Ligand binder design. Structure first.
Ligand SMILES: *[C@@H]1O[C@H](CO)[C@@H](O[C@@H]2O[C@H](CO)[C@@H](O[C@@H]3O[C@H](CO[C@H]4O[C@H](CO[C@H]5O[C@H](CO)[C@@H](O)[C@H](O)[C@@H]5O)[C@@H](O)[C@H](O[C@H]5O[C@H](CO)[C@@H](O)[C@H](O)[C@@H]5O)[C@@H]4O)[C@@H](O)[C@H](O)[C@@H]3O)[C@H](O)[C@H]2NC(C)=O)[C@H](O)[C@H]1NC(C)=O
Ligand SMILES: *[C@@H]1O[C@H](CO)[C@@H](O[C@@H]2O[C@H](CO)[C@@H](O[C@@H]3O[C@H](CO[C@H]4O[C@H](CO[C@H]5O[C@H](CO)[C@@H](O)[C@H](O)[C@@H]5O)[C@@H](O)[C@H](O)[C@@H]4O)[C@@H](O)[C@H](O)[C@@H]3O)[C@H](O)[C@H]2NC(C)=O)[C@H](O)[C@H]1NC(C)=O
Ligand SMILES: *[C@@H]1O[C@H](CO)[C@@H](O[C@@H]2O[C@H](CO)[C@@H](O)[C@H](O)[C@H]2NC(C)=O)[C@H](O)[C@H]1NC(C)=O
Ligand SMILES: *[C@@H]1O[C@H](CO)[C@@H](O[C@@H]2O[C@H](CO)[C@@H](O)[C@H](O)[C@H]2NC(C)=O)[C@H](O)[C@H]1NC(C)=O
Lengths: 132, 458, 132, 132, 53, 52
């Protein structure tokens, strides 16, 4: 929605801040996931391990329709048993680093509720184009 | 106006990379490890065609290229890799008692009949063997009171690995290709000196087939210039730069070893053999090379006129080589297995004053200049490579017939306000053999992300 | 849109043409950035040296909102000191290959003025959805 | 679209079904294209051969404007000589595995007809934004 | 000693046949024919997909 | 995972899995003998009497 990029705060400078402050500076952690140089067979693996990881994060966001390095809001209903917390006590004081300790037990079954049906809404868009 | 980015933009930056090898398909019909090209290189195809570009003008340069140094390192490491499974000799550092090799009631002047005690495959037992060795391979042992006891020219500095008889030294052509994201720019100017701007540039993926020919003082089986003889140097003012002359028309040289050698196998240790020369079955004759005299004189007069382009008032003299060790002052090459070291003082003896003399009204149209060659087997070939190799003998007479397409001259030092400015042959650094072939090519990195202003707003 | 490709001019055939003519053919340079074969340890790096470069060009265009191999126009103001030239004397006669010689002194800070936060207009769009 | 994912049917469970049923399940075949572990120099190739083949499929769909792992419908006209079959006798009984045997001979020239004109409509959208 | 020189097998390594699973890389699959009357050449009408043999 | 109505051709005698496994077992068995003793001083003459 704009041409601009990442901020000068450095690779992990937003760690320890709020969830809203770490909703900014996402571009910097997105930027620093690729590099390359040479120290032989021990380091050549450290080349390809930079790729095998990164495309995996380009898999799932391509699965969910997000398709980038951005905020991607969906319409899967949040089950209240996952956090049992309102928006203001999550976003204004908590950190991502300690929010992951509460959500990481449930991220797999969240992916298990992001599991079943993106392709049929792609088919719904195709039905809206073709039939309608 | 607003900034706007574009992907797929043809923008170049010259950079270093790791170019890889491509060889033609028919060599893959042969067995593995015969030549290094057919073993692992990729199969080339004429589908990446030569594509002429638009109005691009691009700078090219030979003398600080990276393709020639990378090719030199590849050929060093690949020839080192080819000698790993072969026999390392080592029980051939014994004392050799070398008498005269009187081949059927007459002595030979080049070969000694050296007898030595080999350890057999049973390491407590020994047997006496004999072999005929060339005199460049043989050094007298010490200052002791015995003139009949000799030694190999090695064992003082290194231990030589015998070259395997199932691998060949045939120069299969090599195509150097840039990886994805890079391109190879080829300068198509026929009058191209080798340094400066080129106004007719094309893009290729894989270079033309470079023959990895190892040769000093002449260039064999190379590519030919399109319309005129091209003289290349980094700077012609400096005397210490090797002047590479590139001929428009080749001169055919035919080389031969006439005496009918044989191959004799000596089993050294468990299950590995040492191949040496046995008897000479016939009569003793001189190994030699032949060049046509009229065509060589015409070629030297033409090299005179495009040398006189840079030296306008002076004549052009050719002198013999500077002298020294035989591996330096002789035309050294490989005539199908055997390493020839030919004397070039008959070729480079003449001068050109300014007037061209036609080859017509000759004394004889079949007159030939004959060079007399020595043959080696212990090849102190390079450095950092496993620096020596014993080339096993090959049975029968041998001939090879090749084309001279280049010369490696060197101007003498400036003195006496000289009218002639004489030139001598030179060699010893092998990069100049492959720098004369990689003169058209350069490697560029594609930078496809570009920035331009336009009236588009998001 | 249309699901179609490139032109037959080959990998660098638009070099030496105008900026308008090299605003065509852009698909061809983008398609020839990946290949694969084998010549051992000297060539294996020549495999990954493609990918380690190519994903880098998929990083920056993934950040700037472009997300592909295409024309991507922004709303970042062009500082006039970079070129001091109008549109017609850039686009109709100059080549990209010689435009880069003038612009590459400044491309770092133009990329530098394409910095701070695309993330905030991934937030404002969310402010169009969550709040509005 | 919706923010959901794959199906539970496994990697190739839709093989042998119809084109309608294999127009579902498309996410699973696209999700199992990347993995990583170690068995030395023989298996390191099996790492990079996972990536060199994946990004090529991310090339062409990026060329055609699809830009993801999804149903992507174009407006290039279908020549009738390719199949000579109507819609219902393709989508309700045929399998993709046997449809590829009929379409694979013409797939190269179909991609050739998918090689003309994406760059000019990106210029046309630039004309729609800038000139209009 | 007439043809080669034998190296002694190390006493700390074993000749025991530990089973080996052959796996295809990512982007490939292994088809297993589940026909019990299968000769070994020809069509199989009961095929499964597996990652590691 | 059992599949649907797929019928697929199989063949043993020109498979590539068996040749690759043969090459792997050859190269792995060669690799396992590299650090071991090569003998070589056992090529001496052996005086062999009856092992009574
Ligand atoms: C394959 O071939 C082998 C040779 O190639 C052969 O080995 C040889 O076998 C013969 C036949 O037995 C031996 O010859 C006999 O040696 C005895 C010596 O016995 C006394 O000494 C031993 C210690 O041995 C020392 O002496 C010998 C001979 O001088 C030396 O070679 C050796 O290096 C030692 O220095 C000692 O332990 C004995 O004491 C034991 O036995 C007594 C009873 O006899 C017990 O009461 C006591 O508690 C203890 O257990 C004994 O005092 C000698 O007396 C004979 O005259 C004869 O010379 C060779 O020594 C032997 N050589 C080698 C190198 O081993 C293999 O037998 C043969 N194998 C097969 C299957 O065919
Ligand atoms: C290089 O130098 C080597 C030695 O260092 C030379 O080899 C020797 O050459 C001499 C000269 O010819 C040989 O000596 C002669 O041998 C005659 C034997 O001929 C009869 O026997 C043949 C089989 O040879 C056996 O006998 C000899 C002598 O006892 C043994 O040494 C052999 O090992 C064999 O057991 C038959 O085939 C043949 O028909 C004859 O019946 C003998 O009659 C002479 O009196 C003389 O001694 C000598 O045998 C060679 N030794 C070896 C090891 O080859 C070599 O020729 C030199 N070559 C050159 C080019 O200079
Ligand atoms: C080459 O010369 C040698 C030496 O003269 C010849 O051999 C001997 O010749 C002498 C007399 O000339 C005789 O006493 C010996 O009996 C000869 N010995 C042998 C082994 O022949 C020899 O004949 C000459 N020719 C050749 C072909 O070797
Ligand atoms: C070994 O020598 C013979 C004769 O000395 C060679 O035979 C000649 O080969 C040339 C090749 O150009 C022909 O022109 C001649 O007609 C041949 N015969 C004669 C009688 O000269 C033979 O080629 C040589 N072997 C090798 C491998 O070169």
């Amino acid at each position: 929605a704009v041409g601009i990029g990442a901020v000068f705060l450095g690779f992990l400078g937003a760690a320890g801040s709020t969830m809203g402050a770490a909703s900014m500076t996402l571009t910097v952690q997105a930027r620093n996931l690729l590099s390359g140089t040479v120290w032989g067979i021990k380091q050549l693996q450290a080349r390809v391990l930079a790729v095998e990881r990164y495309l995996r994060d380009q898999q799932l966001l391509g699965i969910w329709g997000c398709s980038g390095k951005l905020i991607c809001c969906t319409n899967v209903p949040w089950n209240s048993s996952w956090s049992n917390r309102n928006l203001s006590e999550i976003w204004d004081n908590m950190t991502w680093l300690q929010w992951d300790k509460e959500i990481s037990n449930y991220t797999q079954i969240i992916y298990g509720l992001l599991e079943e049906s993106q392709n049929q809404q792609e088919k719904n868009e195709q039905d809206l184009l073709a039939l309608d | 106006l607003w900034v706007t980015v574009y992907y797929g933009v043809p923008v170049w930056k010259e950079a270093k990379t790791t170019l890889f090898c491509a060889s033609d398909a028919r060599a893959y019909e042969k067995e593995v490890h015969n030549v290094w090209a057919t073993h692992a290189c990729v199969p080339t195809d004429p589908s990446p065609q030569e594509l002429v570009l638009g109005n691009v003008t691009e700078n090219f340069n030979m003398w600080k290229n990276d393709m020639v140094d990378q090719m030199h390192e590849d050929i060093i490491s690949l020839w080192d890799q080819s000698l790993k499974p072969c026999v390392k000799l080592t029980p051939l550092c014994v004392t050799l008692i070398c008498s005269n090799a009187t081949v059927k009631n007459g002595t030979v002047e080049e070969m000694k009949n050296c007898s030595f005690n080999t350890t057999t495959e049973i390491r407590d037992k020994e047997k006496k063997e004999y072999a005929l060795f060339y005199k460049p391979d043989i050094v007298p042992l010490s200052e002791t009171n015995n003139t009949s006891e000799y030694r190999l020219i090695n064992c003082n500095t290194s231990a030589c690995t015998q070259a395997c008889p199932k691998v060949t030294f045939e120069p299969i052509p090599i195509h150097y290709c840039a990886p994805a994201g890079y391109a190879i720019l080829k300068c198509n100017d026929e009058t191209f000196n080798g340094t400066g701007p080129c106004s007719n540039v094309s893009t290729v993926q894989c270079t033309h087939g470079i023959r990895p020919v190892v040769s000093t003082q002449l260039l064999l089986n190379g590519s030919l210039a399109e319309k005129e003889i091209v003289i290349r140097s980094e700077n012609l003012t400096n005397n210490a730069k090797i002047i590479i002359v590139h001929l428009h028309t080749p001169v055919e040289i035919v080389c031969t070893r006439p005496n009918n050698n044989t191959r004799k196998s000596v089993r050294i240790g468990p299950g590995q053999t040492f191949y040496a020369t046995g008897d000479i079955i016939g009569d003793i004759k001189q190994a030699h090379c032949n060049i046509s005299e009229e065509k060589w004189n015409d070629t030297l007069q033409k090299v005179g006129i495009e040398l006189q382009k840079h030296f306008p008032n002076k004549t052009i003299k050719y002198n013999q080589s500077a002298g020294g060790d035989m591996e330096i002052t002789t035309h050294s090459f490989n005539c199908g297995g055997e390493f020839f070291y030919c004397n070039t003082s008959n070729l480079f003896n003449g001068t050109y004053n300014g007037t061209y003399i036609s080859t017509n009204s000759s004394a004889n149209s079949t007159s030939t200049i004959t060079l007399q060659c020595r043959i080696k087997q212990i090849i102190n070939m390079w450095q950092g490579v496993g620096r020596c190799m014993y080339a096993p003998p090959i049975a029968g007479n041998i001939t090879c017939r090749s084309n001279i397409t280049g010369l490696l001259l060197t101007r003498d030092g400036g003195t006496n306000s000289n009218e002639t400015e004489t030139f001598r042959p030179a060699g010893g650094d092998m990069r100049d053999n492959w720098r004369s072939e990689l003169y058209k090519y350069k490697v560029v990195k594609i930078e496809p992300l570009g920035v331009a202003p336009t009236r588009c707003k998001r």
